[PDB]
Design a protein around this nucleic acid. Structure first.
Ligand code: ZN
Lengths: 64, 95, 97, 103, 78, 80, 105, 91
DNA sequence: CCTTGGCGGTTAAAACGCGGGGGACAGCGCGTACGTGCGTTTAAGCGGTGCTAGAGCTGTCTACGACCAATTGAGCGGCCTCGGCACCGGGATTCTGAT
DNA sequence: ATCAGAATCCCGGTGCCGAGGCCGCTCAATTGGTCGTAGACAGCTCTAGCACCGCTTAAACGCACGTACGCGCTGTCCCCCGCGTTTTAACCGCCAAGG
């Protein structure tokens, strides 16, 4: 079953903190970051061990 | 609190004129407001085209008449032109 | 016992020409529309009244297109619809090239 | 109010205002909004008169929009006017091709 | 996905249309044409909301997009 | 008078052939005339109304252009 | 560059368009970038459709574009045909639509 | 009462530079250009009145060109317009 | 012992199912409307020619319209009532088919 | 035709809820007063719309005649209607890992 989790991460674009939601679909190995404020979305591959800090880390490197 | 618009009370009175013993739903009143909006918009667009195909920028009632009998079909249109013309006479005959 | 075909359909045509309530119910239609918009812009919310507007316009649209398609098939010396009938009606209206 | 001075029911000056803010021309005459308001007034009179007859048919007191769509779809010139028009809670003509009626 | 459209829904669409007898491939063809319809509609609707600089599509923009396709619908403040 | 009957069957034939129509039935021609007539009725009514407000007793090409744009059957070619 | 057309490197008169907007009863005020933007869109549309015009006229060994060429080039496009769906060209005609049921087999 | 003739000549020499044209072809072209200009401008005026913005900048023109033309044409047109904005803004 | 993440419920449109029956599709055979030619008749088209409403085009003076301070009460936001329909069981009736 | 019986219509009934009355505000319609040029109007000029005809000729009309798609019919075969049978798209309450 999918996991819809709220986090305390800051969006890299709109800078609103505590407004990034992480949807981890392990059945298809696809993780999804969403911003509850400005509405952006970032997708990245996840394994079985990953957690909201794993894809949020991949989002920091995808920008820089 | 921003003040919003409706035409509900006006056409409401007109409905009360033509049928005193008749109620109405609120959504239908909104529908009629949208109806007035649409007819007004088509008329006004024909008025702007009247202006630009006449190279003039004044609007009188004559342009409104020719706009209505451009848009609406004949018999209905001529009755409406009659109503508007008699109203023009009754108003502008007095102040 | 068993009824003879065609009858119940026309009886519910006479029933379904009466209530103008929405035929497709809400949640799956909403999911389909959401799964569609997402393709145009991610993280997009929808005013529920706008969703009802989409629902109304879609259902009336399809009903009228069915009416023309049905009259095409009636002209086609048949009673049952075909997909080619929808193609003919759309080719008259001009959606597809 | 000029509407009362025209003996009518639609507010003139609101329409005169909306003609200004619509970029509809550069200048706006005196009695053009009176004529337009009267046009609107007779239009809605005719429409809702047929709607009143539609409520007389079903013996309903409050107007439902189904009455409105029916009265649009009955009259000729009105339906040719509002051909590209649909209404929420509209429905259509109760209509059956009798070639599909059984024998 | 698109398969959330049930068979008796399109049947009810035939019924309010007044259509009697139904074939097979009708269903998938119906879903396709409905899809393309909603595609153009919601595309220019989100275009309106893009110009709105706001994160919710207005019902107003839906109405105006219907006007832009010449599909004028009353009822919901348009 | 009777220029409605000035419509010739070989003209209808030629229109069917550029229209791509192969086989022609006989009950078609006066129906065609009636549809063409109603078309031109609405067209010239609107064009003459545009010229009514023009206060000129002669209708121009531009008038007919504007009127057919009003019907949405809009035709280019002659400016307008 | 004195002229804004040379300041845009384009081929259309911008102040023409700005006066058209002013003598349009379109808005009350008109900014500086919108007329340039719209004129650039116009110039792209001209060049884009004239490409199909050039190939369609070159199909028949004729240096001059005829209206039949333009209608052919439109109908052979997809985006332009759905653009010009309610649109008719003078001296146009339509495409060769010979149905397969018609050829002598 | 100006038509757009030499503008067409210069576009044509920029694209197929060995190509003539008839008179009425130019007439249909200018009919086309005027139609497109009117449709976009009126749609922009709708943008203003639907959005209560008392003037129109280039962003309105971009979204209106999105609203009229479909995808490929729209994206290439947005590209050309922003490039023109860029080169005019630089000097 | 008390406060979370999962782990299992009744219900109502939704998916199978069969069988068949009535409707879709190929053939059959004619046949009578209709392509095609051919000669015969016709009107349209083209080129001049008078030719004149009348549009096309230009000064001008005005009044109606653009625009500005009071004012003000109608139009508008909020509150409050009741009878108008939404559905429910009764009961009656009318389609529909097997007879 | 003809009866039995499904299907629907249609009549009190009550309930509840929003349509409509209502009422106290305030901001745009109003009222009045002051510039101003757009246009209603007078009038000038030359184009072009109209009408007409003579000559040319290609285009329509009528008919002769076969003929072949349009159509009524037929048999047939099949596959949607429909009614029945589960059955799964939506939400409601004690477990046994946490803290
Ligand atoms: Zn963000």
């Amino acid at each position: 079953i999918k996991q819809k989790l709220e986090t305390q991460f800051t969006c890299l674009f709109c800078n609103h903190d505590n407004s990034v939601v992480c949807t981890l679909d392990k059945k298809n190995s696809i993780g999804l970051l969403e911003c509850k404020k400005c509405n952006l979305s970032f997708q990245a591959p996840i394994n079985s061990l990953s957690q909201p800090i794993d894809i949020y880390s991949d989002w920091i490197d995808a920008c820089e | 609190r921003s003040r919003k618009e409706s035409y509900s009370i006006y056409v409401y009175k007109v409905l009360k004129q033509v049928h005193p013993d008749t109620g109405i739903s609120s959504k239908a009143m909104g529908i009629m407001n949208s109806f007035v909006n649409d007819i007004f918009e088509r008329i006004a667009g024909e008025a702007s085209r009247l202006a630009h195909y006449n190279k003039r920028s004044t609007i009188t009632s004559r342009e409104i008449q020719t706009a209505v009998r451009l848009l609406l079909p004949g018999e209905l249109a001529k009755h409406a032109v009659s109503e508007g013309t008699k109203a023009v006479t009754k108003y502008t005959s007095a102040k | 016992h068993r009824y003879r075909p065609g009858t119940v359909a026309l009886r519910e045509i006479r029933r379904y020409q009466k209530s103008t309530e929405l035929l497709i119910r809400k949640l799956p239609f909403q999911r389909l529309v959401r799964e569609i918009a997402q393709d145009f812009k991610t993280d997009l919310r929808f005013q529920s009244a706008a969703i009802g507007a989409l629902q109304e316009a879609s259902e009336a649209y399809l009903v009228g297109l069915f009416e023309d398609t049905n009259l095409c098939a009636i002209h086609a010396k048949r009673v049952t619809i075909m997909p080619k009938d929808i193609q003919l009606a759309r080719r008259i209206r001009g959606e597809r090239a | 109010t000029r509407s009362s001075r025209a003996g009518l029911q639609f507010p003139v000056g609101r329409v005169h205002r909306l003609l200004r803010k619509g970029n509809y021309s550069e200048r706006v005459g005196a009695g053009a909004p009176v004529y337009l308001a009267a046009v609107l007034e007779y239009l809605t009179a005719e429409i809702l008169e047929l709607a009143g007859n539609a409520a007389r048919d079903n013996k309903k007191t409050r107007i439902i929009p189904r009455h409105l769509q029916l009265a649009i779809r009955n009259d000729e010139e009105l339906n040719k006017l509002l051909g590209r028009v649909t209404i929420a809670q509209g429905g259509v003509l109760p209509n059956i091709q009798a070639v599909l009626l059984p024998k | 996905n698109i398969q959330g459209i049930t068979k008796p829904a399109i049947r009810r669409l035939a019924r309010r249309g007044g259509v009697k007898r139904i074939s097979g491939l009708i269903y998938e063809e119906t879903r396709g044409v409905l899809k393309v319809f909603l595609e153009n509609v919601i595309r220019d609707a989100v275009t309106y909301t893009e110009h709105a600089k706001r994160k919710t599509v207005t019902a107003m923009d839906v109405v105006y997009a219907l006007k832009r396709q010449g599909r004028t619908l009353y009822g919901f403040g348009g």
